[PDB]
Scaffold this active site. Structure first.
Site, PDB file in Angstrom:
ATOM      1  N   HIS A   1      44.133  63.142  -2.475  1.00  0.00           N
ATOM      2  CA  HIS A   1      43.504  64.101  -3.363  1.00  0.00           C
ATOM      3  C   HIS A   1      44.029  63.873  -4.771  1.00  0.00           C
ATOM      4  CE1 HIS A   1      47.334  65.968  -2.167  1.00  0.00           C
ATOM      5  NE2 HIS A   1      47.343  66.350  -3.431  1.00  0.00           N
TER       6      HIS A   1
ATOM      7  N   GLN B   1      47.252  61.511  -4.799  1.00  0.00           N
ATOM      8  CA  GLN B   1      48.424  61.785  -3.979  1.00  0.00           C
ATOM      9  C   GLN B   1      48.126  62.056  -2.524  1.00  0.00           C
ATOM     10  OE1 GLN B   1      50.881  64.784  -5.657  1.00  0.00           O
ATOM     11  NE2 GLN B   1      51.041  63.765  -7.653  1.00  0.00           N
TER      12      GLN B   1
ATOM     13  N   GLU C   1      49.482  72.637   0.074  1.00  0.00           N
ATOM     14  CA  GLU C   1      49.166  73.128  -1.264  1.00  0.00           C
ATOM     15  C   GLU C   1      47.758  73.715  -1.320  1.00  0.00           C
ATOM     16  OE1 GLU C   1      50.648  70.590  -4.369  1.00  0.00           O
ATOM     17  OE2 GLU C   1      49.055  71.087  -5.789  1.00  0.00           O
TER      18      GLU C   1
ATOM     19  N   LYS D   1      52.702  53.152 -11.416  1.00  0.00           N
ATOM     20  CA  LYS D   1      53.888  52.990 -10.589  1.00  0.00           C
ATOM     21  C   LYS D   1      53.606  52.174  -9.338  1.00  0.00           C
ATOM     22  CE  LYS D   1      55.220  57.680 -11.838  1.00  0.00           C
ATOM     23  NZ  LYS D   1      56.580  58.017 -12.314  1.00  0.00           N
TER      24      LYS D   1
ATOM     25  N   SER E   1      47.573  61.506 -10.915  1.00  0.00           N
ATOM     26  CA  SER E   1      47.541  60.454  -9.912  1.00  0.00           C
ATOM     27  C   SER E   1      46.954  60.928  -8.600  1.00  0.00           C
ATOM     28  CB  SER E   1      48.941  59.868  -9.700  1.00  0.00           C
ATOM     29  OG  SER E   1      49.809  60.832  -9.139  1.00  0.00           O
TER      30      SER E   1
ATOM     31  N   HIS F   1      50.463  63.772   0.852  1.00  0.00           N
ATOM     32  CA  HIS F   1      51.719  64.269   1.405  1.00  0.00           C
ATOM     33  C   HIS F   1      51.713  64.139   2.915  1.00  0.00           C
ATOM     34  CE1 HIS F   1      52.467  65.690  -2.624  1.00  0.00           C
ATOM     35  NE2 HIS F   1      51.284  66.274  -2.591  1.00  0.00           N
TER      36      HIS F   1
ATOM     37  N   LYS G   1      54.341  69.190   2.068  1.00  0.00           N
ATOM     38  CA  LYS G   1      53.886  69.856   0.842  1.00  0.00           C
ATOM     39  C   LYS G   1      52.447  70.305   0.981  1.00  0.00           C
ATOM     40  CE  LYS G   1      54.554  69.766  -4.165  1.00  0.00           C
ATOM     41  NZ  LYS G   1      54.973  68.971  -5.355  1.00  0.00           N
TER      42      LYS G   1
ATOM     43  N   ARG H   1      51.859  58.115  -3.760  1.00  0.00           N
ATOM     44  CA  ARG H   1      50.771  57.888  -4.712  1.00  0.00           C
ATOM     45  C   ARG H   1      49.776  56.898  -4.143  1.00  0.00           C
ATOM     46  NH1 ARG H   1      55.587  57.847  -7.312  1.00  0.00           N
ATOM     47  NH2 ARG H   1      56.009  59.760  -8.503  1.00  0.00           N
TER      48      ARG H   1
END
Length: 387
Positions: free
Chosen positions: A251, A96, A130, A276, A94, A98, A128, A270
């Site tokens: 991303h 995403q 990353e 969802k 998916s 953050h 988050k 998301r």
């Protein structure tokens, strides 16, 4: 023992490759289960273990935080502040975002006040940050394209939606935001219209990002996320290259195998390629609609002796690669470290102990047990804290 070889968990999410981990590292999978993620860390749901009897790495750290983590990480975080993964994406994941730290805290507090238990975008109050490091060629989306790039990509699908026409009239951040939200908010005949036009354009447009859209449509044919590669940079990381995923930036991991290191959070907003429900206003309130040029997407590493550092703009983790040779190299840090054999073979040494790591195997080094002497061939990857 001074150096602790890790017993790691493999998440069998439906999207994982049935072969990558087996082909790369000889990991058994007799029943051909999808093997999505190999977890290296102290996550409460599935902690890596160490042999003493096996014990949870998480429990071992909790019994001797300062000795295991070092004082800096101990006083700042109160736990191992990162999770380190091999990610094996056979299907697209998916899109995403953050939120930054301050908004992740507010989001967490908002949902606590509402009373959502774990059904929930803000499961904790952490950011988050990353980093992704390609082990095989790795297809991803990261950040908004330059406005004129977006303009160039949208004109062949201008008739898909009026929000596209609206952006094309005045291509700026406000209308990028509206288009972004309008696309995610599409319903019924509005959505089918937009998706029909995109699908037809795939026959008249050639190369990237059109090829990537086609790739994604196999798994997500009815998803408004199919427009995102026209809005977001599509990047094909060569093995050895890396990219940092900033806060407030959309991303997606689409295809291939990579190392991923992240701070400890289960928060996610998301932004498509998912069945969802999506809180669009929340998502939009936490997205920075500033283009990122292709030239600034990859992390430029720094090479010093045998050590290739990938500078990370947060304190939550650090990440480096180490050239191994017959002559030994001391690998040392003021924190806990996890060392992972990327390729070749690593012999680690601490006083009397040898630990051999074949590709795909990993070891935990407590702060109080640094440094270790490393030799062999190929490369070792390290996650640690620089503080």
């Amino acid at each position: 023992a001074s150096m602790q070889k890790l017993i790691n968990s493999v998440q069998n999410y439906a999207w994982g490759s049935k072969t990558a981990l087996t082909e790369l590292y000889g990991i058994a999978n007799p029943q051909q289960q999808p093997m999505a993620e190999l977890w290296m860390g102290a996550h409460p749901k599935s902690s890596s273990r160490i042999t003493t009897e096996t014990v949870s790495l998480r429990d071992a750290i909790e019994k001797n935080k300062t000795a295991m983590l070092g004082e800096a990480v101990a006083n700042r975080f109160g736990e191992l502040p990162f999770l380190f993964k091999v990610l094996c994406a056979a299907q697209p994941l998916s899109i995403q975002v953050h939120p930054n730290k301050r908004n992740s805290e507010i989001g967490f507090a908002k949902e606590n006040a509402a009373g959502i238990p774990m059904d929930r975008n803000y499961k904790d109050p952490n950011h988050k940050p990353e980093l992704v490091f390609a082990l095989t060629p790795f297809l991803a989306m990261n950040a908004f394209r330059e406005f004129s790039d977006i303009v160039s990509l949208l004109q062949p699908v201008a008739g898909a939606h009026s929000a596209i026409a609206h952006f094309l009239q005045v291509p700026n951040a406000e209308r990028l935001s509206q288009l972004f939200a309008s696309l995610l908010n599409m319903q019924g005949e509005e959505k089918s219209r937009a998706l029909a036009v995109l699908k037809a354009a795939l026959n008249s447009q050639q190369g990237e990002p059109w090829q990537t859209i086609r790739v994604i449509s196999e798994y997500y044919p009815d998803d408004s996320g199919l427009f995102s590669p026209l809005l977001l940079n599509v990047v094909k990381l060569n093995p050895g290259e890396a990219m940092f995923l900033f806060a407030e930036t959309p991303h997606a991991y689409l295809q291939g195998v990579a190392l991923a290191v992240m701070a400890n959070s289960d928060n996610v907003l998301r932004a498509g390629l998912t069945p969802k429900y999506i809180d669009i206003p929340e998502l939009v309130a936490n997205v920075k609609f500033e283009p990122k040029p292709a030239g600034e997407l990859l992390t430029a590493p720094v090479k010093s002796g045998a050590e290739l550092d990938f500078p990370i703009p947060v304190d939550d983790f650090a990440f480096s690669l180490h050239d191994l040779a017959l002559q030994e190299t001391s690998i040392g840090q003021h924190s806990a470290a996890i060392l992972f054999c990327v390729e070749g073979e690593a012999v680690l040494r601490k006083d009397e102990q040898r630990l051999v790591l074949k590709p795909g195997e990993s070891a935990f080094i407590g702060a109080d047990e640094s440094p270790v002497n490393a030799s062999g061939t190929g490369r070792l990857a390290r996650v640690y804290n620089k503080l």
